[PDB]
Amino acid sequence: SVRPWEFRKVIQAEYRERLPRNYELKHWKKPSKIMIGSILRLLETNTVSALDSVFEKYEKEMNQMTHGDNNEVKRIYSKKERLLEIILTKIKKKLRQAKFPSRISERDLDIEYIYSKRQFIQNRYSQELQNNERLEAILSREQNLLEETRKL
Amino acid sequence: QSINDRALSLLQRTRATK
Amino acid sequence: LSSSITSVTTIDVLSSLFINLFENDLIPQALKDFNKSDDDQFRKLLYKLDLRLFQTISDQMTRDLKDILDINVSNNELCYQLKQVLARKEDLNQQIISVRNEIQELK
Numbered sequence: 001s002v003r004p005w006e007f008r009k010v011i012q013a014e015y016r017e018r019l020p021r022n023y024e025l026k027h028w029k030k031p032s033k034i035m036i037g038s039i040l041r042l043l044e045t046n047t048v049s050a051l052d053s054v055f056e057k058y059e060k061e062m063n064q065m066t067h068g069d070n071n072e073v074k075r076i077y078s079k080k081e082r083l084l085e086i087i088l089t090k091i092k093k094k095l096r097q098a099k100f101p102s103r104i105s106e107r108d109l110d111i112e113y114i115y116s117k118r119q120f121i122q123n124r125y126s127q128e129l130q131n132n133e134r135l136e137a138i139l140s141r142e143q144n145l146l147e148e149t150r151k152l
Numbered sequence: 153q154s155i156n157d158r159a160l161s162l163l164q165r166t167r168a169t170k
Numbered sequence: 171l172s173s174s175i176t177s178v179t180t181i182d183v184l185s186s187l188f189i190n191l192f193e194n195d196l197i198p199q200a201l202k203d204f205n206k207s208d209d210d211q212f213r214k215l216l217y218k219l220d221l222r223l224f225q226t227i228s229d230q231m232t233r234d235l236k237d238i239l240d241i242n243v244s245n246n247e248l249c250y251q252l253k254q255v256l257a258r259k260e261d262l263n264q265q266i267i268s269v270r271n272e273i274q275e276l277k
Contacts, residue, residue, distance in 0.1 A: 004195040007187060014183040024176045039184065042234050043227070045169040050226035054219055065212055080219060084227075087196070105177045109184070111163045114241045118159065121248050128255045135262035142269040149276045155244050158237050 007094040015101065028099035034113075035106035040092050047084050051077065174246045178239060185235040192228030200224060 002009050015025055055062065055077055066072045100106070107113045204217035 004191045010187050010190060011183055014186050015179065018179050018182065019176065041166050041169060042231060045166050046227045046230040046234065048169060049165070049230065050223050053226055054222045057222070058215070058219065061215060065215055076216065076219075080216075080223060083220070084223070091191075100180060101176050103176055104180045105174075106180075108177045108242050109181065109238060111159065111166055111238065111241075114238065114245060115159050115163050118156065118241060118245050118248070121245060121252060125248060125252050125255065128252065128259060132255060132259055132262060135259065135266065139262055139266050139269065142266060142273065146269050146273050146276070149273050155240055159241050162234055162237050 005090070005094060008098040011098050011100065024101050024103050027102040029102040031095065031098065031100055032106045035100075035109050036092060036096055038110040039095060040088065043088055043091060047088065051081060051084070171246075174242070178242060178246075181235055181239040181242065185232055185239075188231045188235075189228060192224050192231075196224045197221065197228070 002013060004010065012028075019025060055073075062073050062076070063070070066076075200217055200220040204214060204221060207214040207217055
């Protein structure tokens with residue numbers, strides 16, 4: 001019964017299929033603009049990429065069906081662009097209207113965020129490892145001193 | 153190949169859009 | 171892995187949402203049109219373009235959401251490793267203090 005365009009329903013069913021019944025699936029919230037924006041930017045990126053991909057692949061068939069009229073080809077490109085934007089517009093409308101568990105971190109869907117977090121945590125890890133290396137050396141020095149002192 | 157490589161490639165492609 | 175499991179799941183839910191939309195709706199409808207268009211060779215080609223366009227977008231969406239999932243899962247592990255190194259740091263500091271105190275009293 002659930003149709004692919006009913007995003008609110010699909011999303012709630014998918015969560016329920018994947019995770020046990022517990023508190024996390026009890027409060028629900030509409031998504032943030034950056035979640036919507038991140039997802040639509042992914043969709044737009046791939047839509048432009050697909051358009052170029054596909055039109056280049058079928059260039060000869062295209063040019064042979066338009067009898068060399070490259071203006072008509074640009075027109076067909078624009079028609080397909082318009083079809084995809086109308087689709088993406090409904091995707092955005094239905095996603096804005098869907099709900100997600102409130103404990104999720106929607107910024108996890110933003111490549112800018114998770115990329116900048118990863119660079120920082122990698123650097124922080126390297127700094128702390130070196131600090132522990134140094135503390136291990138200091139501790140060793142002190143433990144040697146204690147062993148000598150225990151023997152007077 | 154790497155996760156960082158893949159991450160940077162996605163970041164670049166999304167920034168090049170709009 | 172429980173603090174992040176609902177956020178990781180969100181990425182999979184979205185990936186499944188768009189596979190369902192493209193593979194179980196947009197692409198079947200474009201096929202239904204393309205199979206029906208043997209009289210108009212132009213519209214046959216254009217429906218084929220729709221087919222390829224939806225399949226390309228859907229496959230690439232899945233790959234990019236898997237990228238995002240892999241980054242998050244890897245980041246979460248690194249964050250937990252950072253917690254362990256910081257726990258060890260605090261312990262090394264305390265042990266250094268205790269050993270110094272011991273030297274001070276035995277000296």
